[PDB]
Design a binder for this molecule. Structure first.
Ligand SMILES: NC(=O)c1ccc[n+]([C@@H]2O[C@H](COP(=O)([O-])OP(=O)(O)OC[C@H]3O[C@@H](n4cnc5c(N)ncnc54)[C@H](O)[C@@H]3O)[C@@H](O)[C@H]2O)c1
Ligand SMILES: NC(=O)c1ccc[n+]([C@@H]2O[C@H](COP(=O)([O-])OP(=O)(O)OC[C@H]3O[C@@H](n4cnc5c(N)ncnc54)[C@H](O)[C@@H]3O)[C@@H](O)[C@H]2O)c1
Lengths: 535, 535
């Protein structure tokens, strides 16, 4: 090869609507029936070998219909974990020695497979196992994962061409090496996109990986692994180990070849892994790159100039999309009294009518909560709210785990200015207290990933962007604060977090490299003496 | 202001030679006499106030003439440290609210002051206190610090214009916020450039800082502080606390407002601070950004095709420049027998004749070791080498701490393939064992920051760049592996370190920011129902 090649130019994948009579709806139904009617083994995928292991068998079910099994996995044992580590270390040399363009082709090809023949399958599997409506499955499992692959390939190519100045007499270049060691990718239930990206991002840059997906996302994960295999991912570059991950960590965090951890999920899990790696820091051949994101909860503030209709829709969608189970969901709204008079009743009537049920009925707005643990935490939050003097349940609050893990959309009214679920707290404040409410938000916020202001008044908007500059990761104007699209709304971690390097920009990819400068001098000095030293 | 402004285009500052009869030599002598003859108090500089504190008095002396005092500082006490923290937190709001261009002007103006009227003063102070020849002082205290300022301003401006895609219906922008909290900058004796950059880099991006320079670099540091003040640095943006730093850390690492640490120095100090911050992680308002570099030792491998003259000069300069006291110095050479026959005697004769003495005599090649601790470690390394069967002292080895901390350039011959000082170990290997020697280097290297191959044969060069890809940070061809120039040879940390973000590229600056996306949607949805849900 004698070339300076360019990659295809990425653009965001269009979101299909699955409207009645559309051909994608019909294709989705065929995939929904096929996955739901033929449950499978969900094995470990180690050095290209699909194998059930010897650890306990654990079923993956439809959260919205928990009697209906989708598959059964086995809990990784220590020997499984040790096999995944050795297979990653064994694939490394032939993977790192493939040219970037051939590595990139794998992910570009996976993107195009996901965009086309696998589209409704990966969407259906995400709908079924994670309890997502077709819209939620589409923006995540299809569009966001496709965009991660195409955009990462573009970002990587952009990194490779960042090169230094050459002075007279020399040539300086930079080589973006992979890491020495394996990468451990641990992924959450709630996004099939994040589950795919976490292991493939470091892989693109020449690394090999063990991937520990969430149990309740393991159907879409296994199918993501199969898609990558059909795209030409070589055996052992990414190794999938199923289960709770406890035995995987026992092995991986003890191995001196651990190069880094790529994690998204709860702050409790992050802290544990973080303290563990710190406790063991003396064993590692290299300082492990810890790249992680943890949760928060989002807020909306509506100014007296807010459009009522926009506000109501941003609260319903922001709080209740995916049953409030995104990275963050709208949990706290601060609404000016005069705007509350115009849209308060409608917000409550619409929340009352919103349909949660079986997501194979495309009527429904959404599905169930992810598992019995989530359902219990939501029951407890609701009962705490019923008993707290400072909060009234204005609508919702009902729950029933008999057919699925269902919690109704719930709105709490609070007169005073955790869990993940469809619970929205609304405080109504006097219009003239806008600035004082901004201060409350600023003083009490450590865990907002995104905030929003709803206001037509430019001065009110700029006042929010200024005063709340540090009170939230990302910040939205006149829209819901959820649903970052790749290439468009990067970053967005919690306050005080160190998250410039999260998924969605070139900075994540640089975490999976170790850059080196190469300097060549054409005519170097042949006498050591310097001009100052002369008589 | 209604503008999209650009910054001046940076280029590397030219290095003055200080040759006999040059006007810069004459200006340097005036500055050398003035600093040497009028020793000063070296106070703390807190919220713009220069004050001696109540901790013990510690003299700063000429390492090469340790009876000659340059100044006297006081060991920061706890109350001093607490005052530096409060003054930083108190300057923050007016500094963060200055527009980038006005912050940048401070550093561009400091650069131009250092390039011109302060040039020979900051060079003289670095020569006197750190025992550097005029060449060593010039490439560091003047050129590298000037280039850090101008290049950082250019890199920062480049970061600010990295912006996302806007979709139809919206406008997405990115705001590069400063950190919330103060930055703690701890700097080493050996570079006046690093000492300046560490505190000013995060400052450029809107942060405020406490700076704890090395005792033996404190003359040039205090004068750097005065230069920044003459450039318009506002009071309390950077606060200088003198001494051993123990009492400064007691306060800073305990303060919940610690945003990050910017450190360069030994791995023992780094580990200690790192474990301390990890032990206290639960107290901090934000996860502290730990940005640090630690040492190593460098190697040169000469192929049978090496140019003898180039090799000899690269070994002398690489090992003996600044008495071997740079970030890394050439400590191990692997030389093909046939090339050793051609330049071995000359290398030994030239090392024997090389002059180390008082650096005010511009004849000398260099000066003394930095302090009594460095001198003792070098005495011990030499005596260990005299007693080890595997090594012969071929030249040098003599030392005398009576007038200054002087250690002679020393070459050890080793038949088998720590401290910082002028000690070079040479192993001579059979020409045909090139590839086997590359393997030895690779297997035994954890602490090489830079390596070099000396070879005219292209195949031998490519074999070294390939086999030693992971055995060294940066890698040099046909030159000494020391003296990275800003914008030209970035990166260059030790093996397994996490140092993409070190001084010398835009990645260091991003460590001092927290990026946020702002999304505005012009016509957001006014109904929550999705197209899939339709009858
Ligand atoms: N900030 C973001 O972008 C973002 C995105 C998605 C989810 N989240 C957050 O994550 C949580 C959502 O999902 P979750 O419940 O899957 O989080 P979780 O922490 O319970 O689980 C995350 C993953 O870690 C695994 N795990 C847990 N302990 C482990 C161990 N010791 N060793 C190995 N693996 C282990 C789990 O099986 C799962 O695969 C919420 O708090 C949410 O806010 C954040
Ligand atoms: N990698 C690089 O780019 C690079 C560059 C320069 C120096 N270095 C390394 O650093 C060392 C050189 O210099 P050094 O001797 O000044 O290193 P050092 O670690 O002894 O001291 C570094 C700084 O930390 C301070 N310090 C030490 N303990 C402290 C504490 N507990 N709290 C606060 N401050 C504390 C010292 O006074 C000094 O200012 C060598 O090992 C060298 O390789 C590395």
């Amino acid at each position: 090869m004698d070339a300076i090649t360019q990659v295809p130019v990425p653009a965001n994948e269009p979101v299909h609507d699955y409207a009645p009579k559309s051909p994608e709806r019909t294709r989705l139904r065929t995939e929904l029936a096929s996955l739901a009617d033929h449950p499978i083994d969900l094995p470990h995928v180690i050095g290209g070998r699909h194998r059930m292991g010897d650890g306990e068998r654990i079923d993956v079910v439809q959260p919205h219909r928990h009697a209906a099994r989708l598959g059964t996995l086995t809990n990784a044992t220590h020997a499984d974990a040790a096999a995944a580590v050795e297979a990653a270390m064994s694939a490394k040399s032939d993977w790192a020695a493939l040219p970037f363009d051939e590595r990139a082709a794998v992910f570009l090809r996976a993107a195009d497979l996901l965009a086309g023949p696998w589209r409704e399958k990966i969407a259906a599997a995400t709908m079924l196992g994670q309890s997502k409506s077709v819209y939620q499955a589409e923006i995540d499992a299809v569009c966001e994962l496709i965009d991660f692959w195409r955009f990462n390939v573009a970002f990587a190519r952009q990194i490779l061409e960042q090169q230094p100045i050459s002075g007279p007499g020399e040539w300086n270049r930079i080589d973006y090496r992979p890491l020495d060691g394996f990468v451990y990718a641990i992924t959450p239930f709630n996004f099939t996109s994040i589950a795919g990206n976490l292991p493939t991002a470091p892989a693109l840059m020449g690394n090999t990986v063990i991937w520990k997906p969430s149990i309740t996302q393991t159907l879409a994960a296994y199918l993501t692994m199969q898609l990558l295999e059909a795209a030409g991912l070589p055996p052992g570059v990414i190794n999938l180990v199923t289960g709770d991950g406890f035995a995987v960590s026992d092995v991986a965090l003890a191995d001196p070849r651990l190069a880094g951890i790529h994690f998204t999920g709860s702050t409790a899990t992050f802290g544990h892994l973080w303290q563990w790696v710190g406790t063991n820091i003396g064993r590692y051949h290299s300082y492990p790159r810890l790249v992680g994101e943890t949760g928060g909860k989002d807020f909306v503030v509506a100014h007296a100039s807010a459009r009522p209709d926009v506000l109501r829709t941003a609260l319903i969608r922001g709080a209740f999309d995916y049953q409030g189970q995104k990275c963050s969901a709208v949990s706290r709204a601060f609404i000016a009294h005069s705007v509350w008079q115009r849209m308060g009743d409608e917000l409550l009537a619409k929340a009352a009518e919103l349909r949660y049920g079986d997501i194979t009925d495309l009527s429904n707005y959404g599905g169930a909560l992810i598992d019995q643990r989530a359902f219990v935490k939501n029951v407890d939050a609701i009962e705490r709210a019923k008993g707290a003097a400072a909060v009234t349940v204005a609508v919702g609050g009902e729950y029933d785990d008999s057919e699925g893990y269902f919690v109704r959309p719930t709105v709490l009214l609070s007169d005073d200015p955790e869990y993940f679920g469809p619970l929205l707290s609304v405080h109504v404040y006097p219009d003239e207290r806008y600035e004082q409410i901004l201060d409350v938000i600023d003083t009490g916020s450590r865990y907002a990933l995104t905030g929003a202001v709803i206001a037509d008044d430019r001065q009110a908007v700029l006042t929010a962007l200024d005063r709340l500059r540090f009170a939230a990761g990302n910040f939205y104007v006149n829209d819901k604060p959820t649903g970052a699209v790749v290439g468009r709304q990067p970053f967005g971690g919690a306050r005080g977090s160190d998250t410039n390097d999260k998924a969605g920009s070139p900075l994540n990819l640089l975490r999976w490299t170790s850059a080196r400068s190469i300097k060549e001098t054409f005519v170097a000095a042949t006498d050591h003496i310097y001009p100052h030293m002369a008589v």
